[PDB]
Amino acid sequence: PNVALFKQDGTQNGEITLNEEIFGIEPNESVVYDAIIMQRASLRQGTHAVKNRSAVRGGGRKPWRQKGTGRARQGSIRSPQWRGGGVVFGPTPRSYSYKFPKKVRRLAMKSVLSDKVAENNLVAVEGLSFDAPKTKEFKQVLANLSIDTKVLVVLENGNDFAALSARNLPNVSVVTSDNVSVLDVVSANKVLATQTALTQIEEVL
Amino acid sequence: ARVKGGTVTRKRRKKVLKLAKGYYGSKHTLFKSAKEQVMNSYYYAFRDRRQKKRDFRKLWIARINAAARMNGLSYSKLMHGLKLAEIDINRKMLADLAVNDAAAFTALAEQAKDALSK
Amino acid sequence: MKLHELKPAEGSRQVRNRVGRGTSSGNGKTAGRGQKGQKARSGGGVRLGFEGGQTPLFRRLPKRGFTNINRKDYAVVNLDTLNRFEDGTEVTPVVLKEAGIVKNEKAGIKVLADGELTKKLTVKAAKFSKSAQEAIEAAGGSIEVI
Amino acid sequence: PKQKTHRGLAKRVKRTGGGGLKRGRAFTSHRFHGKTKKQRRQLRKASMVAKGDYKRIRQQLARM
RNA sequence: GUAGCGGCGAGCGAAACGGGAAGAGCCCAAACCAACAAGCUUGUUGGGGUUGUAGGACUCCGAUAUGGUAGUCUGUUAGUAUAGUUGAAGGAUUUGGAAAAUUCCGCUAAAGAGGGUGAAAGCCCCGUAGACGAAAUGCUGACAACACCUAGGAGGAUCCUGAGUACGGCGGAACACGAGAAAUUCCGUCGGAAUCCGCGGGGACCAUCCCGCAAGGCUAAAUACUCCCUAGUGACCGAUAGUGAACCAGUACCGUGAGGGAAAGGUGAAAAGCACCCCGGAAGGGGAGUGAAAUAGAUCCUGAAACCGUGUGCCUACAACAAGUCAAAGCUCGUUAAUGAGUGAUGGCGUGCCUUUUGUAGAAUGAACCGGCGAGUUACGAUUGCAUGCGAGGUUAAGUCGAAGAGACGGAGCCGCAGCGAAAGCGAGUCUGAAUAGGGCGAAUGAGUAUGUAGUCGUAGACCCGAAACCAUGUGAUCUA
RNA sequence: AUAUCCGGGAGUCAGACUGCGAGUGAUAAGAUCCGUAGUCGAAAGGGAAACAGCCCAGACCACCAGCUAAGGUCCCAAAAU
RNA sequence: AGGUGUAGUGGUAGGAGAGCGUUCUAAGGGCGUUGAAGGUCGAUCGUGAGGACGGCUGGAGCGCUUAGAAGUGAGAAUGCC
RNA sequence: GGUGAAAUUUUAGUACCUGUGAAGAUGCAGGUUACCCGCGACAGGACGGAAAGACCCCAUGGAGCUUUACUGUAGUUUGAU
Ligand SMILES: [K+]
Ligand SMILES: [K+]
Ligand SMILES: [K+]
Ligand SMILES: [K+]
Ligand SMILES: [K+]
Ligand SMILES: [K+]
Ligand SMILES: [K+]
Ligand SMILES: [K+]
Ligand SMILES: [K+]
Ligand SMILES: [K+]
Ligand SMILES: [K+]
Ligand SMILES: [K+]
Ligand SMILES: [K+]
Ligand SMILES: [K+]
Ligand SMILES: [K+]
Ligand SMILES: [K+]
Ligand SMILES: [K+]
Ligand SMILES: [K+]
Ligand SMILES: [K+]
Ligand SMILES: [K+]
Ligand SMILES: [K+]
Ligand SMILES: [K+]
Ligand SMILES: [K+]
Ligand SMILES: [K+]
Ligand SMILES: [K+]
Ligand SMILES: [K+]
Ligand SMILES: [K+]
Ligand SMILES: [K+]
Ligand SMILES: [K+]
Ligand SMILES: [K+]
Ligand SMILES: [Mg+2]
Ligand SMILES: [Mg+2]
Ligand SMILES: [Mg+2]
Ligand SMILES: [Mg+2]
Ligand SMILES: [Mg+2]
Ligand SMILES: [Mg+2]
Ligand SMILES: [Mg+2]
Ligand SMILES: [Mg+2]
Ligand SMILES: [Mg+2]
Ligand SMILES: [Mg+2]
Ligand SMILES: [Mg+2]
Ligand SMILES: [Mg+2]
Ligand SMILES: [Mg+2]
Ligand SMILES: [Mg+2]
Ligand SMILES: [Mg+2]
Ligand SMILES: [Mg+2]
Ligand SMILES: [Mg+2]
Ligand SMILES: [Mg+2]
Ligand SMILES: [Mg+2]
Ligand SMILES: [Mg+2]
Ligand SMILES: [Mg+2]
Ligand SMILES: [Mg+2]
Ligand SMILES: [Mg+2]
Ligand SMILES: [Mg+2]
Ligand SMILES: [Mg+2]
Ligand SMILES: [Mg+2]
Ligand SMILES: [Mg+2]
Ligand SMILES: [Mg+2]
Ligand SMILES: [Mg+2]
Ligand SMILES: [Mg+2]
Ligand SMILES: [Mg+2]
Ligand SMILES: [Mg+2]
Ligand SMILES: [Mg+2]
Ligand SMILES: [Mg+2]
Ligand SMILES: [Mg+2]
Ligand SMILES: [Mg+2]
Ligand SMILES: [Mg+2]
Ligand SMILES: [Mg+2]
Ligand SMILES: [Mg+2]
Ligand SMILES: [Mg+2]
Ligand SMILES: [Mg+2]
Ligand SMILES: [Mg+2]
Ligand SMILES: [Mg+2]
Ligand SMILES: [Mg+2]
Ligand SMILES: [Mg+2]
Ligand SMILES: [Mg+2]
Ligand SMILES: [Mg+2]
Ligand SMILES: [Mg+2]
Ligand SMILES: [Mg+2]
């Protein structure tokens, strides 16, 4: 659809046009949920382990004779019901990542982007220029555009100084147009994208 | 992650022990004894909510029988006579009249005796 | 969507059943295994197809046949699939691969006369069923063994 | 690891177009004097794995 | 989990092709030549030569170039590791013992990672982003030096091209392949070739064809692993956990020895760790102090339960009681204020819990009590239900880039779209059969596939605990024979 | 108002007594083994003094309400001396 | 959204369904020296697992909502400490 | 007066007779006896404690032993090479 275009100074220039296949489709909420769960799982490290009865130190010998002592029969001091014994089952190192079908990944990405536009949370700017990286200036740009909530700032490749000046603000998340994920978009209340970043996204998708 | 036992175990056992207050010795003190007796108390309490209905009807009938005989009539004949007279007063009410308002009980007895003769 | 308001599609996700966690769950104590016997034991149970010592079904039956070392299996294409090409098209194993109709041609493409062909084609394939050849040429096309 | 096909079964049955299993017949090896011509003729014909047996062996032939 | 192997049982189980990571090729022996030494050859040295569209020696001519390197404490240079330097921005107010909490206005940010500070700090401290730094010693990369390799073409008369070798018999073994029809590789034993018109392989064997050239050696990378070192990470543990060991732990302790192997963290912000007094021989208390708090006093945070005791509201010395429950006077109390609470004379009814059993109050089993710990899990596969995406299609794997991410690329491959037959093969049919018959299985009469999730199964210790035993290294004759 | 059929998941393969019909036994057994029905099992409640299997009867719960079943009505102990 | 009507609602092995509570993760929204968790007491609420609210103790952290992942629930093992 | 364990132990306000019942009950039924708490004594019962019966049977358990069981094999011996 069409979205208002702003300059870095905040005055609204004429609207621009975004590809409808990417920003105009009906969001598929179930697909978005699937993509969110999968991506959150993919971040897990899975480095967790316990010692079962074989891994615990010692415990080879039979603690006492099978019969005649009046005690419960025991085969090892490291049996799981013993204090200090092996853990039964429990965590073992493993991966948590899985891959949805490609078509599902694409639909998920278009859904979140089309949801931002449908709610008018997509603020497209002509460009974000900084002679030198200065947080106060980008902070002023966010004020110029009346953005006070969590914002995903989507920059074109090579815009080092815009990325540097934006990143320290606690409410800002910076990505490049070619590294934008569903979790990135859903986290933000608003998306601030330069004009060239939007064009690159439309070339990626 | 690891989920240690925490406080749920203690909380649950404390509820059982509260139900066992007033029980003798270990039965209000030790969870296993207290739980066993609370279970038996539940079994008794359910069974006794049925039995209390039996016991009170037994009490009323006996009291009505004593008052009936004081009016020259047995319990069984009085209930037959009241049925013939179309009196629907129940045994709880009759026993109450037998004790608290004897004159009214006598008036009922006379109606029953009248109905028996007819 | 919002990270604080996630909702899965209905019926997409279910709660795992944990056995041996109390009697009122219905799987307490014996954990659904019942009482004693081999199948109540940890790791208990007989191998698949074991009939407790009755001669198993497979031992009762004879082995049959052999596998031909030179066996050739052809990728089957029927006429209804060739209606997808326009009149005068040159249908080729390459063309069918690009169309995604035949991803694996195996020993070659063989054309079969299941449906009705309605377009004129010059069809090239490893083999042709006699009926398929008649249908293709009856449609005014032509066949060629490669 | 992958589940393993029961090789002995795989030498004795065939997956049919309906997903059933075609099988040979017992009592077709020798002692044909002990069997009538009718029995021999009708044991010559193939059969299918019965429902009760199929449920018992189905996992053993999943990737046959 | 295919082809196969297999008491054709249980099970075992490839390889090539295809797609990737990484890639690199080279030296000898012999002929022949030269030198030397020796007993025409017979050794040493150097040259020469290196292979299958056969190569080389040799004999002809013709160029002393051009390229390469898996060489060296050869220097020079840069980088880098091993110390470091620098590094923005806050004051009040309310509460408090203390402020970072709070309120008020400010500011800094290429730094809002994190830690510390008398509670929770972007701006107090250590840091962080960023910029910067090396006398010395390593390591790496270049550059230079030096060293070491690197000839084309035409001729075949002759010579060379790995012997006790190949191979065979016998006996074993390895090949997924258990002697099998058993090729290929190897070990022991015995026998034992050819050599370019030659030799080996193409799964017994022969012919033909094709592909190669054994019996000599060397070779980076892609692969495996981590005792250690540096910087980090975690829907990992948080002291019965986590290493056996957070603590002076492989210690104490046990054992002749091999060997077995513990328990045990927390005052407070700061010791400010209680001057002095009093009872006591001391221990220990009581004051007085310190402290926000000492019922935080070192057995020191919190401080459950079992268990032990003190006070006392009600009850109890004619009663046979799984001990409660229902009914109930009297007495004593006053709440999450509820047709309240505690106790309870007396009356009715009433044989615990668990396990295991046809059946257990059971004179069957298990538990002294309390607390903590303690049992269906995960991975890879199979299959079904549910769910989502796409749909006669569905989908990528390894890998590459990328935050240990998403994602992109990657179509090799896998499932499905056609079956029937042991098979040749035919094909909406096909097999059986002489059959246009009948019958079997199929089509008619279509839904699949990827992923998630749950149920169950399979391979794994596979829900947890338990044998007597078996095997393989060790330690013991300080007891005893 | 169920039947089949297709598929996912089981558990069960020690049964007991009672009535009836048989065998075995001595027309003994709380015996043994079948058939048949019931109850127990896996069923609390009422009756049979107590008493899984007998008789009556199937507890979702509340009531200090009523009617009945087996079995009962002189006292224990509800109801006809 | 609810209402009416009829019927049904004992249960072992076992199948199905739906929930309670525990720790952790994410997002959101909150509470804490004007006292978090934990402990203890109470005559509190819900159909159940269980949930609040007060007093006291305690001295730093912790709820709630939605979703996710689990070393997720003990009274019995002549269990271990 | 000083010092001070242990086996055992579901909680116990822990009688008798006859009966009942998994067929031998302190605990169930009916009846009988019995004020509350101990001390010194005795062992009839708690199928008392101790030991997951050793007899008996079973487990396609184990071990040691035997032989004209099976299959192997060290050793010995005979021949070929
Ligand atoms: K089950
Ligand atoms: K067969
Ligand atoms: K036969
Ligand atoms: K496989
Ligand atoms: K076998
Ligand atoms: K050379
Ligand atoms: K800080
Ligand atoms: K250096
Ligand atoms: K062989
Ligand atoms: K070959
Ligand atoms: K070759
Ligand atoms: K304290
Ligand atoms: K007291
Ligand atoms: K009572
Ligand atoms: K016993
Ligand atoms: K047919
Ligand atoms: K036919
Ligand atoms: K689908
Ligand atoms: K599935
Ligand atoms: K296991
Ligand atoms: K399992
Ligand atoms: K000695
Ligand atoms: K019978
Ligand atoms: K029944
Ligand atoms: K409280
Ligand atoms: K567990
Ligand atoms: K225990
Ligand atoms: K018994
Ligand atoms: K005695
Ligand atoms: K022995
Ligand atoms: Mg071990
Ligand atoms: Mg003992
Ligand atoms: Mg441990
Ligand atoms: Mg616990
Ligand atoms: Mg799950
Ligand atoms: Mg059940
Ligand atoms: Mg239990
Ligand atoms: Mg059991
Ligand atoms: Mg059994
Ligand atoms: Mg079973
Ligand atoms: Mg047999
Ligand atoms: Mg035959
Ligand atoms: Mg016959
Ligand atoms: Mg600074
Ligand atoms: Mg401030
Ligand atoms: Mg082999
Ligand atoms: Mg050979
Ligand atoms: Mg040989
Ligand atoms: Mg060649
Ligand atoms: Mg290498
Ligand atoms: Mg430890
Ligand atoms: Mg602790
Ligand atoms: Mg330890
Ligand atoms: Mg205190
Ligand atoms: Mg303390
Ligand atoms: Mg008396
Ligand atoms: Mg008295
Ligand atoms: Mg028995
Ligand atoms: Mg007992
Ligand atoms: Mg007893
Ligand atoms: Mg015991
Ligand atoms: Mg020695
Ligand atoms: Mg000696
Ligand atoms: Mg019997
Ligand atoms: Mg049973
Ligand atoms: Mg009953
Ligand atoms: Mg019973
Ligand atoms: Mg009476
Ligand atoms: Mg009379
Ligand atoms: Mg009912
Ligand atoms: Mg906590
Ligand atoms: Mg657990
Ligand atoms: Mg315990
Ligand atoms: Mg008896
Ligand atoms: Mg008796
Ligand atoms: Mg009693
Ligand atoms: Mg009784
Ligand atoms: Mg004994
Ligand atoms: Mg025994």
Side-chain angles (χ1 to χ4, degrees):
Chain A
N2 288 301
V3 152
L5 190 59
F6 294 92
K7 284 173 293 305
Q8 181 171 336
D9 62 9
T11 63
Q12 205 229 283
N13 206 27
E15 308 170 11
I16 60 169
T17 177
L18 304 179
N19 188 346
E20 300 75 5
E21 313 321 323
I22 297 160
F23 302 90
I25 59 110
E26 176 70 3
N28 186 320
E29 304 301 337
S30 47
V31 160
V32 169
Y33 174 90
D34 292 342
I36 286 166
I37 296 303
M38 171 280 306
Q39 190 170 350
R40 286 257 291 114
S42 67
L43 292 162
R44 299 187 64 162
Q45 188 163 298
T47 51
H48 41 49
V50 291
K51 297 187 180 305
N52 76 348
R53 61 186 297 176
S54 57
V56 178
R57 187 84 163 177
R61 77 174 52 166
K62 190 172 171 64
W64 48 80
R65 291 177 64 84
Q66 172 85 357
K67 303 182 75 59
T69 63
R71 295 214 65 181
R73 60 213 182 183
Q74 310 293 344
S76 162
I77 63 167
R78 302 314 190 200
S79 288
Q81 81 273 30
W82 285 61
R83 166 178 183 282
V87 179
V88 170
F89 300 138
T92 183
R94 59 191 174 107
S95 178
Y96 291 87
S97 64
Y98 54 89
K99 304 209 81 71
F100 292 129
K102 279 180 193 182
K103 290 175 183 177
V104 175
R105 303 171 214 160
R106 183 57 51 90
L107 179 54
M109 201 64 217
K110 294 177 174 179
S111 295
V112 299
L113 292 175
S114 297
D115 188 57
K116 285 290 185 283
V117 169
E119 311 314 328
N120 299 281
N121 293 334
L122 185 286
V123 187
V125 293
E126 168 167 23
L128 289 161
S129 187
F130 305 87
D131 40 318
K134 182 137 292 305
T135 302
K136 174 188 281 203
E137 297 186 19
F138 199 99
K139 168 161 177 157
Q140 179 55 46
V141 165
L142 296 180
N144 289 342
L145 310 164
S146 64
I147 300 160
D148 56 359
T149 61
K150 284 173 66 167
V151 60
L152 184 71
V153 186
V154 185
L155 306 171
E156 65 289 336
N157 262 325
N159 200 341
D160 290 354
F161 287 2
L164 278 180
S165 56
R167 70 186 185 181
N168 198 47
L169 297 169
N171 264 31
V172 166
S173 308
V174 183
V175 297
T176 56
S177 62
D178 69 348
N179 206 318
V180 184
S181 69
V182 162
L183 202 54
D184 293 316
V185 173
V186 178
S187 311
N189 190 22
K190 286 195 175 298
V191 167
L192 173 60
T194 70
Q195 203 165 344
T196 49
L198 288 172
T199 280
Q200 293 173 347
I201 284 176
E202 297 178 356
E203 178 178 338
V204 170
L205 305 176
Chain B
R2 181 169 181 266
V3 187
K4 75 206 306 302
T7 70
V8 299
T9 295
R10 179 193 294 109
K11 275 173 60 181
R12 177 178 46 80
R13 293 179 188 150
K14 287 210 70 167
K15 294 234 293 162
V16 171
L17 289 173
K18 181 155 181 57
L19 295 177
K21 279 187 180 307
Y23 294 179
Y24 174 88
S26 299
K27 300 196 166 198
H28 73 258
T29 314
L30 315 181
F31 166 71
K32 296 176 187 174
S33 300
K35 180 185 170 182
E36 287 150 18
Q37 192 63 64
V38 167
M39 282 166 56
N40 280 271
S41 283
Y42 278 136
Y43 166 85
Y44 288 143
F46 176 83
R47 165 259 260 170
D48 279 354
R49 285 192 294 278
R50 275 120 281 269
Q51 282 190 340
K52 71 201 281 202
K53 295 157 178 58
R54 309 172 189 175
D55 286 1
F56 273 98
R57 185 172 161 107
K58 177 175 292 219
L59 178 54
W60 302 325
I61 288 164
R63 293 182 171 171
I64 292 164
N65 209 341
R69 316 238 167 200
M70 272 147 52
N71 292 269
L73 221 61
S74 56
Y75 167 94
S76 60
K77 283 292 105 197
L78 174 66
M79 304 305 295
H80 181 45
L82 288 177
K83 188 184 139 207
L84 287 156
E86 302 289 12
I87 311 311
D88 265 334
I89 187 172
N90 70 25
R91 290 152 188 75
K92 183 187 180 180
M93 296 293 95
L94 274 165
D96 194 79
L97 298 173
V99 175
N100 293 119
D101 186 351
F105 188 95
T106 289
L108 287 161
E110 297 298 350
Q111 277 184 252
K113 295 191 288 189
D114 159 90
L116 287 170
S117 85
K118 292 198 182 64
Chain C
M1 228 168 182
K2 290 301 186 170
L3 294 177
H4 51 279
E5 293 154 329
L6 302 174
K7 304 293 235 178
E10 306 306 334
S12 58
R13 313 178 73 88
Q14 296 82 33
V15 173
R16 185 223 290 263
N17 175 237
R18 292 173 295 119
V19 301
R21 292 301 183 275
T23 55
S24 70
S25 64
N27 275 194
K29 185 184 172 188
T30 57
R33 289 180 179 268
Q35 185 67 5
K36 293 184 182 178
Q38 188 172 12
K39 299 166 70 154
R41 311 295 170 191
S42 167
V46 291
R47 60 170 186 268
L48 294 178
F50 190 64
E51 298 187 23
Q54 173 170 272
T55 291
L57 176 57
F58 89 91
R59 302 285 296 263
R60 293 171 229 162
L61 305 168
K63 297 185 297 183
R64 184 169 180 90
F66 74 101
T67 53
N68 175 19
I69 187 71
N70 295 337
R71 162 66 180 185
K72 279 175 278 296
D73 258 305
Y74 292 91
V76 164
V77 174
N78 287 286
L79 298 178
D80 50 307
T81 80
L82 297 184
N83 293 344
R84 301 162 63 164
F85 299 94
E86 296 170 346
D87 298 285
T89 293
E90 191 91 69
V91 187
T92 309
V94 180
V95 175
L96 295 170
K97 182 171 182 194
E98 309 335 313
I101 304 181
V102 183
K103 297 171 181 177
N104 188 17
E105 62 175 316
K106 298 183 175 202
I109 303 299
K110 185 186 285 178
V111 183
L112 302 185
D114 186 6
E116 283 84 17
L117 182 71
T118 58
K119 289 106 182 58
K120 177 176 298 205
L121 310 167
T122 59
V123 180
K124 314 180 65 170
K127 279 198 170 186
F128 288 83
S129 82
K130 307 179 192 175
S131 286
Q133 173 173 128
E134 299 188 27
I136 293 169
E137 300 171 352
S142 62
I143 65 86
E144 179 173 15
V145 180
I146 312 177
Chain D
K2 293 184 179 177
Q3 205 176 249
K4 293 210 174 183
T5 303
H6 190 267
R7 306 305 289 150
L9 258 170
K11 282 150 177 166
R12 293 166 164 93
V13 292
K14 187 204 306 195
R15 186 83 64 183
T16 61
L21 297 170
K22 173 180 172 174
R23 63 172 184 89
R25 311 302 307 277
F27 301 81
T28 58
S29 186
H30 71 159
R31 298 185 62 146
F32 292 104
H33 56 268
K35 284 161 289 204
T36 66
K37 189 67 205 279
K38 183 178 165 182
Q39 286 176 275
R40 296 181 250 155
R41 215 190 309 109
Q42 302 190 334
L43 293 177
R44 191 182 296 163
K45 296 272 160 285
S47 186
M48 307 287 292
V49 179
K51 213 176 71 57
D53 306 314
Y54 181 73
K55 83 212 306 188
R56 192 177 52 242
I57 61 168
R58 59 158 69 92
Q59 192 171 341
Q60 292 180 285
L61 298 180
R63 309 264 49 92
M64 185 178 56

